[PDB]
C-alpha cells in the first residue's frame, strides 16, 4: 500500500542501443547484448551535411528504410528519420544446403535492383610542409624526366597543380596528389641522383585494392598557412557473397550463395524471398523475438500500420495471429512454398515474411589478401605486418 513513487515506464531502463531491439522481453539477454554491440557499426545515414564534409571512411546506404515492428523509443532516437538498414523478405528454410551454419541465400534479381547497396567515401588528406624554409614541398605534376624516386603509377589523371579533378574515374596504384620535395646534389647521390638534379617524388597514391570515382577535392590553407588539400572518392559496394549481414536479434552471418528469381522458391501468390536463413539458428540461440518481429512485420506490411514493438506492453502472440488470420494468410506465419528448380510443392510449409536487416562494416573486399614474395622489414628482415603494406 505504501507506494511512494511510480515508474514512468519500464522500457526506459534500457540504453540507446537496446532500444532498437523489437520485443527484447521475448529474447534472451546475451542476444540483446550482441545486438547492442552490432548496432554501433551498421551502415546508415548519420547526418545530412555529408555532402559538404570531408569525413574519412564513410558508408551511406542507397535506400534506407524504417522498420515495421518499431519501438516507441525510436521516436525519441530519430531512427525513423535516419534508419540504418532495410526490410527484406526473409524465408526460414533448409533449401539447397547453402544456408547451413548461419549462412544466407540472397536473391540476385533483388541485388541488381539496388538492395543493401551502399556508398563508401574515402578521404585522402595531403599537406605540403617547410622544414627550415630552405626546403619547400610543392604540389605539382612530376615529370618523368627530372623526378627521381617516382612511383610506377600513372600520372595522366593529374592536372597542372598536381591534383585530380573530381569526376575522373580512378583505380588502385593511381596517384591522386602529386607532391615533390627538393633535394641536394651532395647529400645522397644515390643511383641516378646526380643526373636527375631536380627533385624527388613524394606523392600520395590511392590504395592498391581500391577503385572508384573522385567525388570532391578541396584546397585550403590550415592554421599556420600551409596549403593542404583534401580528397574524397566515392565507390558503390554491391553486396557480394563475402559481405556480412546482421539483424535486430543478435543474428549475424554472411551470404552463402546468390540465386535468381527462377532459382528461388516462391509462394502461391508470387512473392519471392530476398533472403533465406537456416532454421538451426533459432533453437540454439533461443531468440523467439526474431519470429515475432517477422510475424508482426507481416501483419504491419498487410494492414499498413507499423506495429508497436515496445518491450513491456500487453501485445501477445495470439492477437497477432488473429490479426494475420483476418488478412487471409496462415495465423502461424507458415505459407505453402514451391520449389524453384522443379516447380513442385514443398512437403513442409516455410516460415515466410519480411524482417528488418542491417549491413555491417565487415566486408570481404577489405579482408582478402595474399602475399607471395614481398617487402621485408628493416629490423628483422621478415615479412611486414599489415594488409596495406602487403604483409604476410
Amino acid at each position: 500500500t505504501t507506494f511512494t513513487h511510480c515508474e514512468i515506464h519500464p522500457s526506459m531502463i534500457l540504453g540507446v542501443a537496446a532500444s532498437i531491439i523489437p520485443f527484447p522481453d521475448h529474447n534472451q539477454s546475451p542476444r540483446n547484448t550482441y545486438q547492442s554491440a552490432m548496432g554501433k557499426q551498421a551502415m546508415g545515414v548519420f547526418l545530412t551535411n555529408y555532402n559538404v564534409r570531408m569525413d574519412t571512411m564513410a558508408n551511406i546506404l542507397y535506400y534506407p528504410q524504417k522498420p515495421l515492428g518499431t519501438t516507441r523509443a525510436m521516436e525519441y532516437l530519430k531512427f525513423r528519420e535516419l534508419p540504418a538498414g532495410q526490410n527484406a523478405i526473409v524465408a526460414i528454410a533448409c533449401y539447397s544446403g547453402y544456408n547451413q551454419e548461419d549462412s544466407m541465400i540472397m536473391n540476385q534479381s533483388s541485388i541488381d535492383r539496388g538492395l543493401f547497396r551502399s556508398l563508401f567515401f574515402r578521404s585522402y588528406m595531403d599537406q605540403e610542409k617547410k622544414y627550415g624554409m630552405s626546403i619547400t614541398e610543392t604540389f605539382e605534376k612530376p615529370q618523368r624526366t627530372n623526378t627521381l624516386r617516382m612511383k610506377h603509377g600513372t600520372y595522366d589523371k593529374l592536372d597542372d597543380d598536381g591534383l585530380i579533378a573530381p569526376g575522373v574515374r580512378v583505380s588502385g596504384e593511381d596517384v591522386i596528389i602529386g607532391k615533390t620535395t627538393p633535394i641536394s646534389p651532395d647529400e645522397e647521390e644515390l643511383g641516378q641522383r646526380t643526373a636527375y638534379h631536380s627533385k624527388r617524388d613524394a606523392s600520395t597514391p590511392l590504395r592498391s585494392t581500391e577503385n572508384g570515382i573522385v567525388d570532391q577535392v578541396l584546397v585550403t590553407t590550415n592554421q599556420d598557412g600551409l596549403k593542404f588539400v583534401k580528397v574524397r572518392v566515392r565507390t558503390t559496394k554491391i553486396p557480394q557473397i563475402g559481405d556480412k549481414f546482421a539483424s535486430r536479434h543478435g543474428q549475424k552471418g554472411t551470404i552463402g550463395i546468390t540465386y535468381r528469381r527462377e532459382d528461388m522458391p516462391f509462394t502461391a501468390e508470387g512473392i519471392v524471398p530476398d533472403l533465406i536463413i537456416n532454421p538451426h539458428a533459432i533453437p540454439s540461440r533461443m531468440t523467439v523475438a526474431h519470429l515475432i518481429e517477422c510475424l508482426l512485420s507481416k501483419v504491419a506490411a498487410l494492414s499498413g500500420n507499423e506495429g508497436d514493438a515496445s518491450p513491456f506492453t500487453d501485445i501477445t502472440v495470439e492477437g497477432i495471429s488473429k490479426l494475420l488470420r483476418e488478412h487471409g494468410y496462415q495465423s502461424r506465419g507458415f505459407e505453402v512454398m514451391y520449389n524453384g528448380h522443379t516447380g513442385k510443392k514443398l512437403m513442409a510449409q516455410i516460415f515466410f515474411g519480411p524482417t528488418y536487416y542491417q549491413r555491417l562494416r565487415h566486408m570481404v573486399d577489405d579482408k582478402i589478401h595474399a602475399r607471395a614474395r614481398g617487402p621485408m622489414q628493416v629490423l628483422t628482415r621478415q615479412p611486414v605486418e599489415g594488409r596495406s603494406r602487403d604483409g604476410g
Partner: peptide
C-alpha cells in the same frame, strides 16, 4: 497492436 501515429488528426479533431 500497432503504433498509433495518427494522433495529430485525433488531437486536432478533439481540441
Amino acid at each position: 497492436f500497432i503504433k498509433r501515429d495518427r494522433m495529430r488528426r485525433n488531437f486536432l479533431r478533439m481540441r
